[PDB]
Amino acid sequence: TPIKQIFPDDAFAETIKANLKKKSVTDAVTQNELNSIDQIYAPDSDIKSVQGIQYLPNVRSLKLRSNKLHDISALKELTNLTFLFLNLNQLQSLPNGVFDKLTNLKELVLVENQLQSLPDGVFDKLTNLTLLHLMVNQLQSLPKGVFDKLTNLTELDLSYNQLQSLPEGVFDKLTQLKDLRLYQNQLKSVPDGVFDRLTSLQYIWLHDNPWDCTCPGIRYLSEWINKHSGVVRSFIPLWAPDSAKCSGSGKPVRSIICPT
């Protein structure tokens, strides 16, 4: 049976013809061959309008480009768009409810977002993700025990964010701190309950951290790491022995009487 009326717009028809290198409009295709098509070449895509794609929900590769459309609220009725890979900050308005249906996506990364209200509890039930991105996040408060059953944390990428503080006792069940760096950050609170049973530790990270001199909290560890000062280095070219100086007091070590 003949199928026509595929392209309502005259200019969109010419754009599709040029992009998909189809010479004419009287060609025939099959479903099984198209389903095996995992590459689509549409260079110089002049895709101004999206009307007409609603009737093709069985495409594996897509293409989208719009430099004027800032209201993309039409995405709610759009089920087959998975390829959203563009880099442009011209999009000022961020549509709400993007994540409600977007589960058929294959690859989708996004950076430098202006998301003012990040929904709380993204990791509630969706535990099937393998490679998780925590890019440009703003979660200031976390639910208690939200990561109880999630003892499967192996790949952790936490850099490149605007993280400010951490909750009291977040890494409690996590006894496998292997690789982490804490530079260019503004850490306020160190998690508690992470060094109680961690007496057989083999990796410890203390660089660029404001340890409190409050006796008798970390005096033993500070003295022990000070005794081995011949290994620890710094980033700035300054006299290393003078770096280990507690703030404020200025009195010698032997003259300090720790109260209580």
Partner 1 sequence: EVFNATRFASVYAWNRKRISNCVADYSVLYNSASFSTFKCYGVSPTKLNDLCFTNVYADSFVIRGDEVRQIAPGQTGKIADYNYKLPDDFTGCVIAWNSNNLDSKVGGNYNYLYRLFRKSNLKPFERDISTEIYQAGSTPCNGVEGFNCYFPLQSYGFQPTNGVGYQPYRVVVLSFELLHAPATVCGPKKSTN
Instruction: Kindly report the number of other CB atoms within 10 A of residue 59's CB atom.
Output: 16
Using the contact rule CB under 8 A, the part of the chain among 74-82, 93-101, 116-124, 180-188 near partner 1 is 180-188
55 binds, among its own copies, partner 1, none (CB under 5 to 8 A by kind): its own copies
Question: Which residues from 44-83 bind its own copies, rule CB under 8 A?
Answer: 52, 54-55
**Minimum separation from the CB atom of position 116 to partner 1 (A):** 16
Dig out the tokens for 176 from the structure.
């496998």
Q: Residue 130, class by beta-carbon neighbours within 10 Å (0-12 exposed, 13-18 middle, 19+ buried)? A: exposed
Nearer to its own copies, 29 or 258 (CB): 29
Site string for partner 1, 117-146 (x = CB under 8 A): ------------------------------
Report the alpha-carbon angle 135-139-142, nearest 5. Answer: 130
Stretch 1-40 residues interacting with its own copies (CB under 8 A)? 5-6, 10, 13-14, 17, 23-26, 31
Euclidean distance between CA atoms 175 and 194, whole angstroms: 8
Q: Give the nearest distance from C-beta 17 to its own copies in angstroms.
A: 7
CA distance 65 to 86: 8
Quick check: 162 binds partner 1 (CB under 8 A)? yes
What's the rounded Cα separation, in Å, for the pair 226 and 224? Answer: 5
What stretches of the chain show up as alpha helix (H) in DSSP?
A: 10-19, 31-35, 219-227
Select from its own copies, partner 1, none the partner in contact with residue 25, using the beta carbon and a kind-dependent cut-off of 5 to 8 Å: its own copies
Name the one range near partner 1 by CB under 8 A: 65-73, 127-135, 179-187, 193-201. Answer: 179-187
| Interactions with partner 1, residue window 182-211 (CB under 8 A) | 183-184, 186
- Burial of 250-259, coded b for 16+ CB within 10 Å and e otherwise, reads eeeeeeeeee
- CA distance linking residue 51 with residue 212, whole number of Å: 62
CA-to-CA separations, 24 to 14, 21, 53, 88, in angstroms, rounded: 10, 9, 19, 34
Choose the contact partner of 67 out of partner 1, its own copies, none; CB within 5 to 8 A by kind. Answer: none
Longest dimension (CA), the chain: 98
Binding letters toward partner 1, positions 47-76, x by CB under 8 A? --------------x---------------
Establish if 176 lies at the interface with its own copies (CB under 8 A): no
Distance CA 99, CA 144 (A): 23
Query: How near is the Cβ of 91 to its own copies at its closest, in Å?
Result: 28
Please give the size of the binding site for partner 1, defined by CB under 8 A.
Answer: 14
HSE-CB at 92 with a 13 A cutoff on CA atoms is: 1
Sites of contact with partner 1 (CB under 8 A): 38-39, 61, 85, 87, 107, 160, 162, 181, 183-184, 186, 233, 235
Sites of contact with its own copies (CB under 8 A): 5-6, 10, 13-14, 17, 23-26, 31, 52, 54-55
